[PDB]
Point group: C3
Chain length 101, copies 3
């Protein structure tokens, strides 16, 4: 297994393409996005991005860049979880996630 | 970053408003909720709630489970998280960036 | 609370029923699945989340999904720690004590 940070961004849907561009420019290999309901009826339609990164640095760079650009003006939360990647051709490369020295 | 507990509730979709009322009364600052599927594949719902303490998370879990989960299907679990940004979660002071 | 392993699988939507079969055959008690998007334009994919009482059960699901599909279909599998607080099926009738 390969260590990873899982970065989660929950914010306004209008920001979808701008945030995707930031993730793309970061070096992260990819992302998952989903429609959510958010209360922060007063439920509103949000989006949630999930990004695995190999380093905590990469995750903080994405978080910092999203927040600095948008979070004065738009509601949002960004948080980080630990994770281990078991399989993932792009994340782990072709040697896979359980290579030996 | 600020430590958080992430409380997840997966349950029947008919309980959405009922469970949202409990979360709103708890003092948690917000929640996300999403439409999901479970083994029937039948439509259900998933809430995710960040709390500043484990006690707050447990109080929400206890109240939801006792009120509904002896009558409706539901599962409640908790994970650790660290919050980097969040005006409402961390407050106007921010998420303690040098901690 | 009961310690648990949270296994997540993100893969192509066409695989939904075939992955669900592997989860069901594993001994896992159930799963949540959702429609998601991935970098494409974004394109549609699916995400499963499965809680298991042991690590080896999670890995057995991961290994079986990757060996059958991941030479031919895109996919990522990862694992997180969790604790279950309430869950009649996961914890048994005594609860998650």
């Amino acid at each position: 297994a390969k260590p990873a940070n899982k970065l989660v961004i929950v914010t306004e849907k209008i920001l979808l393409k701008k945030i995707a561009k930031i993730i793309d420019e970061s070096g992260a290999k990819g992302y998952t996005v989903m429609n959510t309901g958010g209360k922060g009826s007063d439920i509103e339609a949000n989006i949630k991005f999930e990004i695995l990164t190999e380093t905590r640095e990469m995750a903080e760079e994405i978080a910092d860049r999203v927040a600095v650009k948008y979070f004065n003006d738009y509601a949002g939360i960004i948080y980080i979880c630990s994770a281990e990647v078991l399989y993932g051709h792009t994340f782990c490369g072709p040697e896979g996630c359980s290579a030996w020295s």
